[PDB]
Amino acid sequence: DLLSKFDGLIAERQKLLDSGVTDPFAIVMEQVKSPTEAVIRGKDTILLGTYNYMGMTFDPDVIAAGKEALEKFGSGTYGSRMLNGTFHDHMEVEQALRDFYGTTGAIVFSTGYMANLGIISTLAGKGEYVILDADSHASIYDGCQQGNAEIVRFRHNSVEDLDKRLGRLPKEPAKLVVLEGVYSMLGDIAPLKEMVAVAKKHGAMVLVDEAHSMGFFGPNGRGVYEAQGLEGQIDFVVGTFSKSVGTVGGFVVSNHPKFEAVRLACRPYIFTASLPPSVVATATTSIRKLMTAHEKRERLWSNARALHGGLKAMGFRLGTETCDSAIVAVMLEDQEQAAMMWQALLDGGLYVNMARPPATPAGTFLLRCSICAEHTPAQIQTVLGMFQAAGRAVGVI
Amino acid sequence: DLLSKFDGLIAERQKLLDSGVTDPFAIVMEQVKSPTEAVIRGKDTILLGTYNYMGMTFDPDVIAAGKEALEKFGSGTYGSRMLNGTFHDHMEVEQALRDFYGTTGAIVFSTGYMANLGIISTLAGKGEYVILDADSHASIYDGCQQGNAEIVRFRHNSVEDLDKRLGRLPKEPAKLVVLEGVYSMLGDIAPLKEMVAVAKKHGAMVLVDEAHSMGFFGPNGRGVYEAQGLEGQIDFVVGTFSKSVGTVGGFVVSNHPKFEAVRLACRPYIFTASLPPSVVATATTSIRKLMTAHEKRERLWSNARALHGGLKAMGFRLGTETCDSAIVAVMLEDQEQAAMMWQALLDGGLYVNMARPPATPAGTFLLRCSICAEHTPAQIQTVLGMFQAAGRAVGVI
Ligand SMILES: Cc1ncc(COP(=O)(O)O)c(CN[C@@H](CO)C(=O)O)c1O
Ligand SMILES: Cc1ncc(COP(=O)(O)O)c(CN[C@@H](CO)C(=O)O)c1O
């Protein structure tokens, strides 16, 4: 039947369970003490696989904003933005985004996935081109799939290939080059400056996904593009509320004068319920605090450097040579090594993300650590001690 | 450039504004007094365009559940379900769905749109078939677009055409027939009994979208399918949290023994953040209350019948001959008539949904009323008085 095509995934999952590891896709934060600590499997566990980069989920202003919205506006909105839909807090979150990015335009979506699905499938139609980095987020690929544009992949972080690939395309059709500031797999940074210059040489518009930089890149927290001096040169910036902001939702911001017209054509914007009052109140409050969250940001980068530097010192192979983001990827030799390492850490009271094929390429097996501005120096050293103990026990280092 | 393709929509929107009507896609609930009353444009306005069928958004248990979750678990989850992701309240909402639908299987998504996008694109692959009603929700069409199955449309609520269309397909490939219990455009009901019997004759699996029936159809509130005696015959039921439940989120439930394997393949499930603790706590609490919400349900249907019956009595042409759902669609002769009627009601203190081409077919212009179990008989008569005053002032009736 229709589910028979899953027999292979069901077998592979059971074969992983046969190894004796905890089901990695069924971990439950039974209790959450803080942005960095939760009770998992009855054990107090340090969290190092969240993308809660700025620890805003327990910020007292954020929580109070959320509680106030539930009291004032209820548990939900009344369907689509384009119908009953739009509450006061939705107009506020959009303005919070404008103020944060210094843009005239801001369209919020009900998820980050849907923002990418939507903006990509809506901006580029038949006969037009979407040119994307080969390791773009799944939501970017799905957006290409939802659209009817021609899709053009280029080699990962290759300025050369972007240029050659763009150059071969016909000049007249409109083009969208899709980049990410920080790429989530290895925690590496795009050379946006060079890629944007290449994009503009060929007359292409540029979309940058800054989900993994919001709040802690650039002088205003706007992302890698702002860090690299590209203010006013990026046509569209996409992001999410689910990383630094600390809730759900997606968005695209832009200074294009027609940008608000996307609301009129964008199906994942039109045909879904708007976010609950509490979600947009917490996002609004968090976003605004993120404009001037210097202490958090400093601690985030201090934590990232300590984890990255310490893990490299012990002899772990990392995804990046230098500490370029709040993601640190530990690269392991085989899938078994990853699992035992992952289980060891979990059992010792640390949760990190495990990444394996097909999540990664066939020749790559990762443990992905995501640093939080609310990790303490003590926690970071405890994690280092834990990686040292696990790596040595498993024979990785 | 990429936005030039919107010039036509920008012109049409401005041409509507030239008429002198309020921008219908920018209405803001500045304040919300209750499920049925809000301050819009500085005026106390009755809400009749929400899909808040059961008035759960201000249920005290729902709100308290939401507040407790913000306090205990924070403003957000830690990314994808398949990673840090899953909190206690996510396991609870899924079980609440199982208990509500009497199913072993329940997969929650971050939106209803994404549940449809995801389940349809994931269940039917290359060489397989998706057979859908021609007026299926936009999210169902988009799911077909996201997949690589063959798409087969049949004439709206035509059991005959479904049968002929299915019959022509090759017998061996797996097939998904997609139906809705209540169709949102006219508020009409599908003949699921006959369509399911046809679907099963051709060996097809059936997906039913019961977004517009949850809580008030069937002896358990499960939807039109339960109302029509189809318990245990529907392979998958899709729904949303954004209508009766009173927040955001989507879901699919099923008794298929492999159903949980969809989590392993479903991209819009894998590659998006899980819902915030407050969202899943409010959904959980609402869903459970909806199992035994008889007073609300009785009032909902009593309200629907009064509005439907009263509007028909005055001489309005309605989408349905009898009161078949909580949606009442008033059919108008031309787009101007719809607008002036819509503006008149708004100005008199009533918001209803306006539907026009291309939202509707070229030969259809609708005002769509959605009834709420928390409307009072007094409000319903006030609305009737308002439709009477507007219709007569505009010359509709
Ligand atoms: C039958 C059906 N199935 C699925 C969905 C998607 O639900 P979501 O809005 O919760 O994503 C809707 C949405 N319907 C509303 C928005 O909530 C709309 O204006 O389109 C629907 O009507
Ligand atoms: C670069 C990028 N762009 C967009 C998204 C989508 O954001 P959403 O999870 O808020 O929908 C993600 C999600 N990333 C996480 C889930 O939040 C994941 O595990 O895939 C992302 O990494």
Side-chain angles (χ1 to χ4, degrees), chain B residues 51 53 134-137 156 180 182-188 212 318-320 325 327-331 353 355-356 358-369:
Chain B
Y51 290 117
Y53 290 124
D135 300 344
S136 295
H137 194 250
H156 176 56
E180 301 182 37
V182 178
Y183 285 98
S184 67
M185 198 184 85
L186 300 180
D188 61 311
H212 288 283
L318 304 187
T320 55
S325 72
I327 296 167
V328 191
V330 180
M331 306 184 73
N353 289 334
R356 289 167 43 154
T360 58
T364 300
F365 314 84
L366 310 171
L367 305 173
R368 296 165 65 267
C369 301

Side-chain angles (χ1 to χ4, degrees), chain A residues 78-83 110 114 270-274, chain B residues 51 110-116 136-140 180 182-184 209-212 238-243 247-250 353 368:
Chain A
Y78 299 144
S80 160
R81 289 289 302 275
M82 308 299 264
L83 305 178
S110 287
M114 287 169 83
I270 298 162
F271 298 104
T272 199
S274 71
Chain B
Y51 290 117
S110 287
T111 66
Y113 174 92
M114 287 169 83
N116 266 330
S136 295
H137 194 250
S139 66
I140 294 170
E180 301 182 37
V182 178
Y183 285 98
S184 67
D209 184 326
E210 297 282 9
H212 288 283
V238 45
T240 180
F241 296 162
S242 59
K243 276 90 194 78
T247 182
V248 290
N353 289 334
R368 296 165 65 267

Side-chain angles (χ1 to χ4, degrees), chain A residues 51 111-114 116 137-140 180 182 184 209-212 238-243 247-250, chain B residues 78-80 83 114 270-274:
Chain A
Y51 290 117
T111 66
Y113 174 92
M114 287 169 83
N116 266 330
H137 194 250
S139 66
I140 294 170
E180 301 182 37
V182 178
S184 67
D209 184 326
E210 297 282 9
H212 288 283
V238 45
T240 180
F241 296 162
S242 59
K243 276 90 194 78
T247 182
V248 290
Chain B
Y78 299 144
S80 160
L83 305 178
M114 287 169 83
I270 298 162
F271 298 104
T272 199
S274 71

Side-chain angles (χ1 to χ4, degrees), chain B residues 12-149:
Chain B
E12 281 176 352
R13 185 187 164 276
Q14 183 48 59
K15 211 186 187 86
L16 168 59
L17 291 168
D18 288 353
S19 72
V21 310
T22 310
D23 178 7
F25 310 143
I27 294 292
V28 185
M29 313 301 95
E30 188 52 32
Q31 302 151 40
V32 176
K33 181 173 183 174
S34 67
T36 69
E37 203 182 334
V39 182
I40 298 177
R41 294 158 74 242
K43 195 184 173 96
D44 291 320
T45 298
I46 298 184
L47 307 178
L48 198 59
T50 78
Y51 290 117
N52 181 32
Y53 290 124
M54 295 288 284
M56 300 302 305
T57 56
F58 287 98
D59 174 277
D61 292 310
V62 169
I63 287 174
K67 285 191 190 165
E68 182 186 68
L70 270 161
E71 173 69 18
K72 284 180 74 184
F73 293 90
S75 60
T77 61
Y78 299 144
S80 160
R81 289 289 302 275
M82 308 299 264
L83 305 178
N84 219 307
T86 301
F87 284 24
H88 168 249
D89 286 306
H90 298 75
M91 301 303 276
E92 204 147 300
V93 72
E94 283 173 348
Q95 191 59 51
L97 286 169
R98 290 194 191 92
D99 296 350
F100 189 100
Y101 286 98
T103 55
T104 49
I107 297 175
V108 168
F109 290 79
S110 287
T111 66
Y113 174 92
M114 287 169 83
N116 266 330
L117 186 73
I119 208 68
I120 289 163
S121 60
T122 300
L123 284 187
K126 202 84 181 189
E128 304 180 322
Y129 295 86
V130 179
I131 307 89
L132 76 170
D133 189 285
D135 300 344
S136 295
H137 194 250
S139 66
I140 294 170
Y141 273 104
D142 291 5
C144 292
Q145 167 71 356
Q146 190 65 30
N148 296 321

